[PDB]
Amino acid sequence: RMLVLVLGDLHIPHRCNSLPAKFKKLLVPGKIQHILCTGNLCTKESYDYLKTLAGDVHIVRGDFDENLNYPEQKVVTVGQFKIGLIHGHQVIPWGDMASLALLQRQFDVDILISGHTHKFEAFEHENKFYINPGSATGAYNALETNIIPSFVLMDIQASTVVTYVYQLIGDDVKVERIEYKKS
Numbered sequence: 773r774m775l776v777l778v779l780g781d782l783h784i785p786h787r788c789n790s791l792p793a794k795f796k797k798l799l800v801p802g803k804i805q806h807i808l809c810t811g812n813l814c815t816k817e818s819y820d821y822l823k824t825l826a827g828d829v830h831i832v833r834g835d836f837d838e839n840l841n842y843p844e845q846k847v848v849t850v851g852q853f854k855i856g857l858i859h860g861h862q863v864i865p866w867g868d869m870a871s872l873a874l875l876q877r878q879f880d881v882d883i884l885i886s887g888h889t890h891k892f893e894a895f896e897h898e899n900k901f902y903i904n905p906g907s908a909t910g911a912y913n914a915l916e917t918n919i920i921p922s923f924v925l926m927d928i929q930a931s932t933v934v935t936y937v938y939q940l941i942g943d944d945v946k947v948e949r950i951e952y953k954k955s
């Protein structure tokens with residue numbers, strides 16, 4: 773059993789001063805084994821925060837993120853799951869076959885994670901799982917202001933992943949539980 777935090781698009785401090793208090797209340801050191809961050813933290817402060825939560829922090833570079841030592845994309849292995857991580861503002865030209873061939877690697881995973889849109893999605897398709905954790909600070913994107921702050925915890929065990937989506941909907945924290953099993 774491994775617990776994974778999936779979040780991103782915090783945009784601190786430029787669109788948000790910090791993670792929603794109600795979310796910080798839920799995140800304590802010593803629980804989570806891995807953090808996958810879709811980028812757009814926008815500062816070392818947040819990275820340092822995440823490192824207090826878990827040692828194994830995988831983050832990728834989002835549009836305009838300062839750090840260069842952040843890979844654009846990665847494939848991580850947790851349990852028996854290959855997990856692909858990319859910010860999601862790449863938006864690749866089809867006709868560029870070479871880049872396309874490289875992409876194969878990112879599509880050939882059990883769990884695909886990306887961000888950028890600040891809009892949460894989670895669903896299983898053809899024995900793969902797709903997650904967009906949305907914005908943990910509910911930061912606005914260029915398209916709209918009312919973004920439900922959300923993040924995801926994945927509990928991974930063997931060939932099963934239970935994904936818990938947390939959303940700050942007004943006053944309260946709502947949780948949907950989504951089960952994904954690989955065959």
Ligand SMILES: [Mn+2]
Binds near residue numbers: 782834888890
């Ligand atoms: Mn963003």
Ligand SMILES: [Mn+2]
Binds near residue numbers: 835888
């Ligand atoms: Mn972005």
Ligand SMILES: [Mn+2]
Binds near residue numbers: 896899952953
């Ligand atoms: Mn299944």
